[PDB]
Ligand SMILES: O=c1ccn([C@@H]2O[C@H](COP(=O)(O)OP(=O)(O)O[C@H]3O[C@H](CO)[C@@H](O)[C@H](O)[C@H]3O)[C@@H](O)[C@H]2O)c(=O)[nH]1
């Protein structure tokens with residue numbers, strides 16, 4: 001059992017951070033998770049009994065106090081596990097100076113479409129020189145790393161894991177929740193991505209206007225990084241279409257399995273390739289049908305017409321056609337959903353994922 | 365010529381900074397000197413008409429180190445980044461990579477365990493090795509220490525500090541005035557012109573004075589530039605412990621160094637850790653004064669003992685005393701030595717030759 005210093009730049013619970021909860025939990029007796037900012041993610045790590053600490057930039061390491069503090073701390077640990085891009089910069093420096101092995105867990109697709117050239121060069125060059133191992137969350141992320149110049153031999157793909165038991169909800173609780181939302185007689189499409197242009201909420205909204213009138217959508221998530229312009233653009237879009245009473249924003253929520261159960265279809269509409277797609281697996285584990293954008297790691301998670309649907313990124317009419325399909329062919333749709341549950345339960349079970357992480361770390 | 369972005373971590377006018385004025389001055393039409401702090405060095409650069417900018421660490425990846433992001437930003441406008449100090453090499457390395465600009469490292473330090481922490485040595489060596497197209501060392505002793513620490517020999521070229529030969533002339537009347545104003549006209553005056561740090565060894569000179577006759581006095585010229593206020597106290601206490609209140613004077617940081625050197629009878633360099641080059645030494649020589657220096661580092665390239673100056677064992681006050689007494693007694697030899705020193709130094713460290721060596725080195729990248 002090695003002492004591990006996990007690093008993550010964000011104090012907010014984005015996908016990489018929620019993923020980090022499961023990655024770190026088995027190591028929590030001897031681990032520390034270091035954050036470069038405070039927020040609800042700190043709270044979450046406490047609730048799960050994972051030791052955590054916020055490093056700050058308050059005061060040769062006079063240029064970057066945070067980096068110095070992390071370097072100091074890293075001396076007390078056997079391994080540095082960088083979970084985000086800024087965390088890789090800091091972890092790489094600490095890996096050199098404290099002479100500690102570095103793992104980089106890659107949750108992004110390092111492509112020009114997602115990031116500036118400088119960010120790509122930095123991540124790729126730091127990973128190549130300092131990382132003993134690059135764990136990619138999907139073959140698509142592995143691929144994009146390599147196309148950006150990253151070293152193939154450093155890469156292993158390990159999917160996000162999920163605690164299977166969290167994804168059941170009673171018929172009775174479903175009914176109540178649908179009641180409380182005021183959607184009991186709607187066909188409900190749930191979108192569970194943080195609000196940001198590339199997560200494509202506006203595509204779902206465009207599709208709604210081509211759907212039957214009983215279809216409403218719940219947008220779950222907040223603008224995690226100050227994309228408040230986008231949120232305003234959504235509200236205006238909703239208004240310009242006839243959609244004011246057909247779209248509810250619920251903000252960031254914690255009861256995701258329950259809200260997914262309350263939906264009739266879960267939709268993922270990213271307009272740029274999704275590296276993995278947690279909401280996709282989560283939908284499947286809740287036994288709900290899911291439609292996703294046909295790119296990135298979604299293609300690995302979904303076989304169209306078998307365990308979900310895939311539509312061309314950016315194309316709202318296709319999304320509408322799939323919604324209509326789910327309304328009309330309910331028995332097909334229920335079998336698809338049910339197949340999804342069975343498959344995803346095997347593939348993405350946190351127990352198997354944890355075993356893979358353990359084996360990979362032991363094999364260094 | 366090429367647009368050069370010079371970088372130097374300090375706003376204080378230390379050796380490396382004084383040397384940088386001369387290095388940068390010919391390129392001033394297209395160059396910029398970036399300081400990572402404000403101070404008297406900014407004023408000096410302004411006075412020599414060399415564009416200067418103070419980068420501060422107030423505000424993507426740039427959030428961790430804004431100063432770095434500003435420098436990286438600035439580097440796109442230049443053809444070459446010229447790092448003059450260690451922290452400037454960290455930042456210049458980063459900027460060399462991101463902005464895609466070649467980097468030169470001008471090495472004014474002896475990178476050895478005695479002078480620096482292990483981390484500093486590793487950082488400096490690895491960055492130079494990976495990012496610098498050239499390491500200009502100030503002395504063979506600096507080149508050597510670099511190589512011994514892991515630095516790549518083939519990156520190194522030695523180029524000494526240069527000096528404006530004309531600045532070292534002082535009237536015998538201005539000299540008499542000055543000795544008078546200091547209250548030292550009847551003394552044998554030993555001047556020390558190093559900044560106040562323990563390794564510059566002012567305390568050795570003070571111990572030496574206790575083994576000298578009472579008409580021997582010292583002027584300590586310089587300041588604690590890097591927080592060595594405890595050393596300043598220690599010196600004063602030392603002075604009080606021995607009987608020396610009347611025989612040692614501190615003048616703080618002075619600009620009139622040629623004149624002050626003229627007003628001494630002997631210039632003393634007494635560093636207790638190896639000196640990388642030693643500007644004061646050459647400066648003394650250019651003033652036609654005799655100089656005793658500590659036998660280590662670049663001082664040994666500068667001084668042949670008995671010929672153009674004297675050398676003594678680092679940390680040994682009795683040896684330094686013996687040389688002071690000898691300079692009192694053997695005035696004719698001493699003046700010959702001092703005079704020889706000026707002829708040599710004036711050929712060997714003329715800023716004109718040195719600017720030329722630097723221009724060819726840069727030119728051939
Ligand atoms: O109000 C909300 C909204 C979302 N979620 C959860 O937030 C996560 C969102 O995940 P996702 O959009 O997949 O993550 P990203 O934030 O985009 O994170 C990155 O890293 C993830 C983990 O590898 C990948 O799945 C993503 O593709 C990648 O962009 C899911 O677990 C949701 O259940 C909440 O808990 N509450």
Ligand SMILES: O=c1ccn([C@@H]2O[C@H](COP(=O)(O)OP(=O)(O)O[C@H]3O[C@H](CO)[C@@H](O)[C@H](O)[C@H]3O)[C@@H](O)[C@H]2O)c(=O)[nH]1
Pocket residue numbers: 377378379380382383472473502525557558559585586587616617618619621639640641642643644647
């Ligand atoms: O009150 C004072 C005292 C000194 N000086 C000047 O300051 C310089 C001090 O030079 P030095 O002791 O050589 O510089 P360091 O600060 O030690 O700088 C480093 O870099 C120098 C330049 O390469 C080398 O000569 C040194 O060995 C090296 O340690 C000389 O020009 C002095 O004339 C002043 O202007 N005013």
